[PDB]
From a paper:
The replicative DNA polymerase from the hyperthermophilic archaeon Pyrococcus furiosus (Pfu) is a member of that polB family and is used extensively in biotechnology applications including high-fidelity PCR. We had previously used polymerase evolution by short patch compartmentalised self-replication (spCSR) to discover variants of Pfu with a dramatically enhanced ability to incorporate Cy3- and Cy5-labelled dCTP and replicate Cy-dye labelled DNA. The resulting variant E10, derived from an exonuclease-deficient version of Pfu polymerase (with mutations V93Q, D141A and E143A) and with additional mutations in the conserved A- (V337I, E399D, N400D, R407I) and C- active site sequence motifs (Y546H) was able to efficiently PCR DNA while completely replacing all dCTP on both strands with cyanine labelled dCTP (Cy3-dCTP or Cy5-dCTP) giving rise to highly-fluorescent products, termed Cy-DNA with applications in advanced microscopy applications. In an attempt to better understand the molecular basis for the altered substrate specificity of Pfu E10 polymerase and generally gain a better structural understanding of the primer-template duplex recognition in this class of DNA polymerases, we have solved the crystal structures of the apo Pfu-E10 and a Pfu-E10:DNA binary complex at 2.4 Å and 2.9 Å resolution respectively and compare them to previously obtained structures.
Numbering used by the authors: 1 to 723, 728 to 754
The structure:
DNA sequence: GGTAAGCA
DNA sequence: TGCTTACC
């Protein structure tokens, strides 16, 4: 199977290399046959003989168009005649493009800034991570002797742990007596053993957690000072930093660096994204953290290292397990998109759709629209449309509730109303559907580019689901499940893609119309659910409704609910389908986007309320959860008021622990660009004053300390407490939190 | 990707 | 307001 691709300049000409892995043997495969090119649309096709002779320059030398062919393609469905300008080297494309645009007989030019190795994959129709191959995986993590004032790198690497399917060890240079620890002469020899372990194991994939930003760049700094070449690549080569977005990733030749941190952040939505937090949130069992302050003492003392070694071992072990679970999802995306895992694993869903289209656009002989210009991109940002409909809830406590939602609303709208730029407002098209409220016409004679592709996706997904039901072997059952999950992720990325400012196939009018149809079909079911079935729709948000027959018998509300979806689906066009999602014994609707329901088994789904927020104290979440609990389960509002008043005294007596006092707030900008200082900013601003590495995306916790003055300067880091203002955590957190529910019951501050 | 509730 | 985070 193909693991990666690249090119190298062999005496001025470009050579594609395919890093394969076939039946156990890893083998590089070269190719010199492939030619870089671009497209040029001419006003006068006779003026080709002039354009053929255009010439640029690069690093002193003179550059020209090696060849030219007249090809007929399509553009947004319509047939187009375009000339294919072949060059010699892919880095000639920037200079030639410029000079060809200037020409008056050239209208525009397309597919010019597509990386050369990616052309190869698309054009040759090759797909990474195909076929049956047992890839060797190896996770690893390091440990640094950090002091609070020290720069990045000055501290020695203390440990390097690595994990595997068979074993999981640690490598250090102090004397730790454990079966998994490996004692070594020095830092120098630690790094050396690591490199040997990598050569011995020979991993097809190297897994890490935060490798791109921390693990690898730290190694590099140390290996520089110790004069050691990090021979990690199969080419014998070192890890190379390669920019992909504004982000700077890390690359290893012949192997696949797989940083989990990127994939994780976009898959789930946890409070904090430390390795410890993520591990528990996936599997269940715990994993503690030993801080850099605690380890530095353990290094000087040299007696506490029994546990620090245990910590490092678990990081590698963790990373491997996490890695092992998140990989098949990511390798299936790579297989579906048709790009190397390394990129996919660091690629936004927007981009994933982009590349998916580019490939399919080739397969259909369609010329890809160009990226937006700087002005267009900016003019696209200052442009919007209305989104989903959200009903003001019928507030209060309600019995016997039902949830009904659409199966893949937006995909079904797209597919069945043929929504795409290549069908928008076509001239003299026979049949079309009009967009509600916004009035965009969509031709339905020939199925549009994107709609057509969603069809194939959902059809295949639909084929897998029926295959899973009917399959016997429980191995393929799991692999099927991953394919089907990947197609889902891609399938639901199209609506967002349409309004993505950097999108080649950006189509605001498409996005607007999908939304438009959404509201129509939801408001239909709404009016139809009450006026013809007697239900009372309590709340709505885009995709689904809550309903009930106020006072009615449980089993009747269910019986009629099933009947309503059986009737309404007959009224809905194409793929637009509604379903019976589930039943909830009670439900409490506070505001829009904020409510709680409780199933027949006793579990409570809380959405939007402080319970699931980061920027609220866990004492406020815990208290509020018990207030909800004691209202949803049964009317014990008497002890409910005692539950919260019991917490006021414990919070007053300083009897409540730390962590339950921590408030988390992400830093979304550079500290310089902040125009208004908050509490989480003032903490991270004074940390950076002591040389600490505060970057965007970093979620810090601030506990408020008892004093008097500004709320921001009184907040100290939550990671290290002071062995807090009781007025804040009561009157500005727990009380407001609990009030949100009890407000409807009429309670004041009591 | 738009809709929406909150804190000083 | 500036700001943050959740919802679909």
């Amino acid at each position: 199977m193909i693991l990666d691709v690249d090119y190298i300049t062999e005496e001025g000409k470009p050579v594609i290399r395919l890093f394969k892995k076939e039946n156990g043997k890893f083998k590089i495969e070269h190719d010199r046959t492939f030619r870089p090119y671009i497209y040029a649309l001419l006003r006068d096709d006779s003026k080709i003989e002039e354009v053929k002779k255009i010439t640029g320059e690069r690093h002193g030398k003179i550059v020209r168009i090696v060849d030219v062919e007249k090809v007929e393609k399509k553009f947004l469905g319509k047939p187009i005649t375009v000339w294919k300008l072949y060059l010699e080297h892919p880095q000639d494309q920037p200079t030639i493009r410029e000079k060809v645009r200037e020409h008056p007989a050239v209208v525009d030019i397309f597919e010019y800034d597509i990386p050369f190795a990616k052309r190869y994959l698309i054009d040759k129709g090759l797909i990474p991570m195909e076929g049956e191959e047992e890839l060797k995986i190896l996770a690893f993590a390091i440990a640094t002797l950090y002091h609070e004032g020290e720069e990045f790198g000055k501290g020695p690497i203390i440990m390097i742990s690595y994990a595997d399917e068979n074993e999981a060890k640690v490598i250090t240079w102090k004397n730790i007596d454990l079966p998994y620890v490996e004692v070594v002469s020095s830092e120098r020899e630690m790094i050396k053993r690591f490199l040997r372990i990598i050569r011995e194991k020979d991993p097809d994939i190297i897994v890490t957690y935060n490798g791109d930003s921390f693990d690898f760049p730290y190694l590099a700094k140390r290996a520089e000072k110790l004069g050691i070449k990090l021979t990690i690549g199969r080419d014998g080569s070192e890890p190379k930093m390669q920019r992909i977005g504004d982000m700077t990733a890390v690359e290893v030749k012949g192997r696949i660096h797989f940083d989990l941190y990127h994939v994780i952040t976009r898959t789930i939505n946890l409070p904090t994204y430390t390795l410890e937090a993520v591990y528990e949130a996936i599997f269940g069992k715990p994993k503690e953290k030993v801080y850099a302050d605690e380890i530095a003492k353990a290094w000087e003392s040299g007696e506490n290292l029994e546990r620090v070694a245990k910590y490092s071992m678990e990081d590698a072990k963790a990373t491997y397990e996490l890695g092992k679970e998140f990989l098949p999802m990511e390798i299936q995306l790579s297989r579906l998109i048709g790009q190397p895992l390394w990129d996919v694993s660091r690629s936004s869903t927007g981009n994933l759709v982009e590349w998916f289209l580019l490939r399919k656009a080739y397969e259909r002989n369609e010329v890809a629209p160009n990226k937006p210009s700087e002005e267009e991109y900016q003019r696209r940002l200052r442009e919007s449309y209305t989104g989903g409909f959200v009903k003001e809830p019928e507030k209060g406590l309600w019995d016997d509730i039902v949830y009904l939602d659409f199966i893949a609303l937006y995909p079904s709208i797209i597919i069945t109303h043929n929504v795409s730029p290549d069908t928008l407002n076509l001239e003299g098209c026979k049949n079309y559907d009009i967009a509600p409220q916004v009035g965009h016409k969509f031709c339905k004679d020939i199925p549009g580019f994107i709609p057509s592709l969603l069809g194939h996706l959902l059809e295949e997904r639909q084929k897998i689901k029926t295959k899973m039901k009917e399959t016997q072997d429980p191995i393929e059952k799991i692999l099927l499940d991953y394919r089907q999950k990947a197609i889902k992720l891609l399938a639901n990325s199209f609506y967002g893609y349409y309004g993505y400012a950097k999108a080649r196939w950006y189509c605001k009018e498409c996005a607007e119309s999908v939304t438009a149809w959404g509201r129509k079909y939801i408001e239909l079911v709404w009016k139809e659910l009450e006026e013809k079935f007697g239900f009372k729709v309590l709340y709505i948000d885009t995709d689904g409704l809550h309903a009930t027959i106020p006072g009615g018998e449980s089993e009747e509300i269910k019986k009629k609910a099933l009947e309503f979806v059986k009737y309404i689906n007959s009224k809905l066009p194409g793929l637009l389908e509604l379903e019976y999602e589930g039943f909830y014994k009670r439900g409490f609707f506070v505001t829009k986007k904020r409510y709680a329901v409780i199933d027949e088994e006793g579990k409570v789904i809380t959405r939007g309320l402080e319970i699931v927020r980061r920027d609220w104290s866990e004492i406020a979440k815990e208290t509020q959860a018990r207030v909800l609990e004691t209202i949803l389960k049964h009317g014990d509002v008497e002890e409910a008021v005692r539950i919260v008043k019991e917490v006021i005294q414990k919070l007053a007596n300083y009897e409540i622990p730390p962590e339950k006092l921590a408030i988390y707030e992400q830093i979304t900008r550079p500290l310089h660009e902040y125009k208004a200082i908050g509490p989480h900013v003032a903490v991270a601003k004074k940390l950076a004053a002591k040389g600490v590495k505060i970057k965007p995306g970093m979620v810090i916790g601030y506990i408020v300390l008892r004093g008097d003055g500004p709320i921001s300067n009184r907040a100290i880091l939550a990671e290290e407490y002071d062995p807090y203002d009781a007025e804040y955590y009561i009157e500005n957190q727990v009380l407001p939190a609990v009030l949100r529910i009890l407000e409807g019951f009429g309670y004041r501050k009591e």
